[PDB]
Write a protein that binds this DNA or RNA. Structure first.
Ligand SMILES: [Ca+2]
Ligand SMILES: [Ca+2]
Ligand SMILES: [Cl-]
Ligand SMILES: [Cl-]
Lengths: 290, 290
DNA sequence: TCGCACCGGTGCG
DNA sequence: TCGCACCGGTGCG
């Protein structure tokens, strides 16, 4: 019952008023410092939410808003996937694959992953797209997970599994991206994944935009290197059931692949996964990689 | 002070519990039955929100959630733009232009606007995109406003201005789409507009997806009819200031226009408007149409 | 200071 | 019954 000394919430000052802030990572640690989560993802998210809700209540404080939990639930789901993806490549012994949880585009633009030769190809494109009366760009939010196949990137440190959630464990999973800055050959990036706790008819179109933009960058790289064999695939994943409507929407073409009558149409999002249990995270990775 | 007899909120039964529901149209009528809104849009939205908030408070009831107001504010902004667009074409005497507020994709798929010859061209595309091992589609939410140039579509009934907000006035603005079912030639549709009370780094990419998909449908129509002169433009509009970041994101290419080194890159969203006052709605329409 | 990216809770047909 | 499309309120660097 010692909820009163929890640190999953945090008081702070704003306009002479004490304000409340959820600490999402702290909530993870306090519930999982002995054992990372198992069973139903959706149920674990609610357990985390009802924990903080009990911490505030016993502390005498105001309930955080629905917006605060949306932000927080998004992080819980991402950290859960990241950690389970870290452990997947260990127990499967995939010594040439990395599954990386990416930060936001300002912290680390995903194009920074690539080597010099490829970063300049992309810069040739970027620069040429601005050299017109009407300036154009190619912008999107960072993919949530990147799957990279490149042997020389794996170090022995990565083969140690994460059995418990600590500030230090979460930090290595969430800074792994740093190790690969500059080192990737263009055709080593093999897939990306967009993660959402839930979908909505509007928010689900964000996955399509993302895949469309990434594949467009990649189609350009296929051309510059004149390599028709290399592929980049993009995927969505939800913590809820995926309806038929969600399915139809996520069948939307990568529009540059439908210009001519003889082109093979390509989907922007190759597939959408409904992650009910942690087991399903393993199942999804099986399809993506193999 | 007679807030107690307002109908902008409405009690209803759910699991033996009386629940509260905002009636957004009713709020509009009760505040604007003598005079449609003028001045600052953003301020009028807050006036509508503080009206309902005062109605519930004086009635003794629970405050509607932040989600309820998001849904409601979205409608207020749309009805305001629609009505002001109705009056724009009247006072400007544009006898060959319609600016139509569109409903959702299930109520009225926007492709229903087109004549038979064009609806079959689109069906040839739709059918061909499914005739592959990997089924693909072209899906998006309905554009908020359509701008259509076709003389034979204007009737004298449309030239009467809307000076006050009544259930009957709002209804004609919101059912105008019905009049044009089947009657549009492909190159009569000249622009679309996506309307948002506010932007966010994720929600703003929805405008890009939309414009990308619409222009892709249109590029196909340009090809089938072999007409290089016809254009379709797509625009965004916010009720808040538009930052530089919002601007950069909305400079994103329509990806099918950047495949070859000699193609002229096209933006998915041709421009983004910050609508501070009702006057700005008139200004935007001036740029779009002329 | 603000930009990024998160997602639930609606009103309505 | 649910699918559509709406958008604010965050935690954090
Ligand atoms: Ca995501
Ligand atoms: Ca809109
Ligand atoms: Cl195991
Ligand atoms: Cl006037």
């Amino acid at each position: 019952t010692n909820l009163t000394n929890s640190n999953c919430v945090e008081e702070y000052k704003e306009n002479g008023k004490t304000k409340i802030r959820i600490k999402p990572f702290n909530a993870l640690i306090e519930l999982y410092h002995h054992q990372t989560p198992t069973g139903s993802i959706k149920e674990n998210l609610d357990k985390l939410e009802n924990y903080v809700k009990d911490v505030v209540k016993a502390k005498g404080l105001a309930i955080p808003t629905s917006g605060a939990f949306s932000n927080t639930r998004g992080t819980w789901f991402e950290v859960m996937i990241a950690i389970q993806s870290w452990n997947y490549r260990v127990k499967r012994e995939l010594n040439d694959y990395l599954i990386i949880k990416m930060p936001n585009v300002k912290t680390f633009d995903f194009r920074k992953i690539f080597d010099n030769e490829t970063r300049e190809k992309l810069h040739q494109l970027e620069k040429s797209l601005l050299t017109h009366k009407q300036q154009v760009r190619l912008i999107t939010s960072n993919p949530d997970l990147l799957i990279i196949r490149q042997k020389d990137l794996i170090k022995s440190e990565y083969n140690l599994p994460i059995n418990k959630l600590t500030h230090e464990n979460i930090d290595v999973a969430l800074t792994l991206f740093k190790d690969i800055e500059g080192k990737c050959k263009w055709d080593s990036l093999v897939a990306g994944v967009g993660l959402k706790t839930s979908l909505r008819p509007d928010r689900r179109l964000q996955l399509v935009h993302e895949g469309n933009i990434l594949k467009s960058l990649f189609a350009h790289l296929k051309m510059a290197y004149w390599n028709p064999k290399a592929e980049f695939k993009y995927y969505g994943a939800s913590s809820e059931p995926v309806s038929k409507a969600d399915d139809d929407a996520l069948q939307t073409a990568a529009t540059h692949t439908i210009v001519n009558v003889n082109s093979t149409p390509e989907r922007a999002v190759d597939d959408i996964f409904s992650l009910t249990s942690f087991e399903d995270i393993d199942k999804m990775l099986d399809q993506i990689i193999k």
